[PDB]
């Protein structure tokens, strides 16, 4: 997250921190995700496509810090890693950038709800907020494009949804943005998601309900003028989500 502010996991209780275990035993952060039901975390396919082996992954819930334990955090293995069969990447655009991780602790349990661990609601079909609406993003991604390390403390920011009209302007993304994607940006281009935020949630209040509207997918640089964050449009993937769940 470029700019924004530090947050805590009680403020983002659906946020899932996804890591990968390496031979030798080293563990590195991969991507964010969102808890959509006790046994299921939703994220982005591109985070896993080169290493599609479920055994490799560790998922934390209730965790505020990248390399430390947070009190009440739960650790999970991945019982099922499900990537979208139609995933593909163009020069910038990522298509069908969506993945499901069925989670289970070593004892076989799914998430236990708490102050720091809660599910987030899915939108209804084709039902997204109006463009100009503010939504939040959350993650452990880079604070600046020049960074090569991720911050220790979870971050959030607020960005506005950008219309397809605007996001398909030639100085933005042209026709590389499709109707299965949502663009979101800071009007002054100061805050945005960035590398390492991928797979994490774009959350919008719909009818006083916090709703998973987008999944961090792609963009040209981070917080670049005329280059919004681009998000998998969760409201267009409900059949896919419901089937595999």
């Amino acid at each position: 997250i470029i700019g924004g502010e530090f947050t805590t996991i009680e403020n983002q209780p659906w946020f899932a921190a996804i890591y990968r275990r390496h031979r030798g035993g080293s563990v590195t952060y991969v991507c964010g995700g969102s808890l959509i039901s006790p046994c299921w975390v939703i994220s982005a396919t591109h985070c896993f496509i080169d290493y599609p082996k479920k055994e490799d992954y560790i998922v934390y819930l209730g965790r505020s810090r990248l390399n430390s334990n947070t009190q009440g955090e739960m650790k999970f293995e991945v019982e099922n890693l499900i990537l979208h069969k139609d995933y593909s990447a163009d020069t910038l655009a990522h298509h069908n950038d969506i993945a499901l991780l069925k989670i289970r602790s070593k004892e076989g349990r799914c998430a236990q709800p708490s102050r720091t661990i809660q599910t987030i609601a899915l939108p209804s079909m084709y039902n997204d907020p109006q463009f100009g609406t503010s939504c939040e993003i959350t993650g452990f991604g880079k604070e600046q494009s020049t960074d090569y390390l991720y911050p220790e403390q979870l971050k959030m920011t607020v960005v506005k949804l950008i219309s397809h009209r605007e996001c398909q302007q030639p100085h933005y993304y042209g026709s590389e943005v499709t109707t299965k994607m949502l663009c979101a940006a800071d009007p002054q281009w100061k805050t945005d998601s960035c590398q390492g935020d991928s797979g994490g949630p774009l959350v919008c209040s719909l009818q006083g309900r916090m709703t998973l509207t987008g999944i961090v997918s792609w963009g040209r640089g981070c917080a670049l003028k005329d280059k919004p964050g681009v998000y998998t449009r969760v409201s267009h993937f409900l059949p896919w989500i419901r089937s595999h769940t």
Partner: peptide
């Protein structure tokens, strides 16, 4: 020209 969001946990030669 690659999207930074895209560059997580990827394989390279």
């Amino acid at each position: 020209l690659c999207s930074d969001r895209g560059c997580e946990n990827r394989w390279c030669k």
